[PDB]
Amino acid sequence: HMQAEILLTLKLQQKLFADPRRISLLKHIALSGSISQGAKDAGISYKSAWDAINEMNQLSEHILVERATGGAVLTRYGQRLIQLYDLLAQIQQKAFDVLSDDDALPLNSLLAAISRFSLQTSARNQWFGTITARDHDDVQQHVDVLLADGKTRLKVAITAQSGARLGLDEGKEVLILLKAPWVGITQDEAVAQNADNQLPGIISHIERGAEQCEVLMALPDGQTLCATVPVNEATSLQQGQNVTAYFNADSVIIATLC
Amino acid sequence: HMQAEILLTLKLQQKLFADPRRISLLKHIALSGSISQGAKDAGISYKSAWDAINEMNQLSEHILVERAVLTRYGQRLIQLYDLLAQIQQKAFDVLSDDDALPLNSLLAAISRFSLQTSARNQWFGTITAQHVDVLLADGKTRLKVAITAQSGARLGLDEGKEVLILLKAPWVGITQDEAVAQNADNQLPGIISHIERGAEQCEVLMALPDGQTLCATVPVNEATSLQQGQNVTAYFNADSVIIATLC
Ligand code: NI
According to the annotation, is B216 in a ligand binding site? Predict the structure, then answer.
């Protein structure tokens, strides 16, 4: 790791609205209770502090700082700006970490940012992919999805109507939500071959309990698959070996932005 | 709404790593296929273009430009800049929303109304007090959701945490028999508002409290006696539900 230092500049009406120094000023105003001590604490003159505050008020059409009921306090909008800025900065810092350690998902994608940094589901699989052209000339009641390698195919059961409401045409980004107990793991291709979906991979981790065994497997694009299988059936399974996961097309829920 | 934009500079080792001008340089290099034309197209001198490339390579510990084409790392750095250009209007719309509650997560705010799923039953609720108890947004219908303590910590399920509840229609049973419904983990009584019988499957829509309508898809021979208007019980296992949070 090498953490990046993030500097954002927000502009409104083609004018500088908020940069690092202005946000620092607003924070020090919140911490100190005054414009004069806050300016001193932020390293800026009193005049330049009021010059910023006045311009920020005019541009945003809101009041950022007010006298307290006297000290200076941040208003609802002043606090909302600091929070928006700091959260946006945090998204960039997290995105930079993803650049640094790498992954197969697009880094320009909103859904992929949502999946990596915000969304958590009880289903232990949450895979990014994209809708692709159907793989047959006849219309069937599912959509076809490519994983982030742009090669690994999956089919998901859905109605034409449902598909239309969610905008599922070629290229639409989606997440695949799939519970782990609904994913089988096998060393017998024929067994997987009677399933709707077959996803080859290598076991990355195994954990056995009394009734169930958890298997984690790297998908071909680097995403992780999680399957829960009855302990009796996981008896031969072992880390580092070749395996195919399999599941039905109607076991998946698609998530997507509309 | 007003013209609004967000500019990003990244520093590494207390030094300049990326800024709009360096990202422009990279994009022009990709398009033109050369450092010298890319510098010309980006309005910087040739030696300044090499200074920037060499500094970016050194501070990052990666190569951004190869023999010219961008590397994957260079393309991905441009994608990081493009993520911000993509979310900027949504972020300014979140800032300008005077009627919204205080901002907790920016990705949750931008996702709340846009994220949609293929499950026909998609409900909001909150955690109340093996599993968790959920109270739907109507404040009355309670659900039991199977989830390990570990996953509950990963989702951050604390009292009052907002959750998204997902249930496909075919995971839901419909019964007019209380002796069947009583042994289910979750029981949701309601009036059947519509029935559609197909050759193998029957879609049942049932009224939920707020005008929410539960959808269930049942094998046709199990719906033979059912009628529009009848009070019925929708039932499902606690482990059939998927619950999600946005942090
Ligand atoms: Ni297909």
Answer: no
Distance, CA A178 to ligand 1 centroid (Å)?
18
Binding residue per annotation — B146? no
C-alpha neighbours within 13 Å on the C-beta side of residue B8: 28
CB contact under 8 A, A8 and B12: no
Which residue shows structure tokens 């946006």?
Answer: A88
SS (H, E, C) A41-101: HHCCCHHHHHHHHHHHHHHHCCCCEEECCCCEEECHHHHHHHHHHHHHHHHHHHHHHHHHH
Residue in chain B nearest A10 by alpha carbon: B6
Domains: count for chain A: 3
What is the distance in A from the centroid of ligand 1 to the CA of A150? Answer: 15
Which residues is A15 bridged to in the sheet? A12
Q: What is the CATH number of the domain that holds A234?
A: 2.40.50.100
Which residues, numbered 105 to 134 in chain B, qualify as contacts with chain A under a Cβ-Cβ cut-off of 8 Å?
A: 105-108, 110-111, 114-120
Instruction: Give the domain extent around B215.
Output: 167-237
A258 touches chain B (CB under 8 A): yes
**CATH assignment of the domain containing B52:** 1.10.10.10
A218 and A185 belong to one structural domain: yes
Measured in angstroms, the resolution is 1.8
Interchain pair B239, A158: CB under 8 A: no
Q: How far is CA B30 from the centre of its chain?
A: 32
Give domain status of residue B225, yes or no: yes
Write the Ramachandran bin of B185: left for phi over 0, alpha for psi from -120 to 50, otherwise beta. Answer: alpha
Torsion of CA B56, B61, B67, B72, to 10 degrees: -90
Task: Choose the closest CB to B3 out of A14, A77, A117.
Answer: A14
Judge if A8 and A36 occupy the same domain. yes
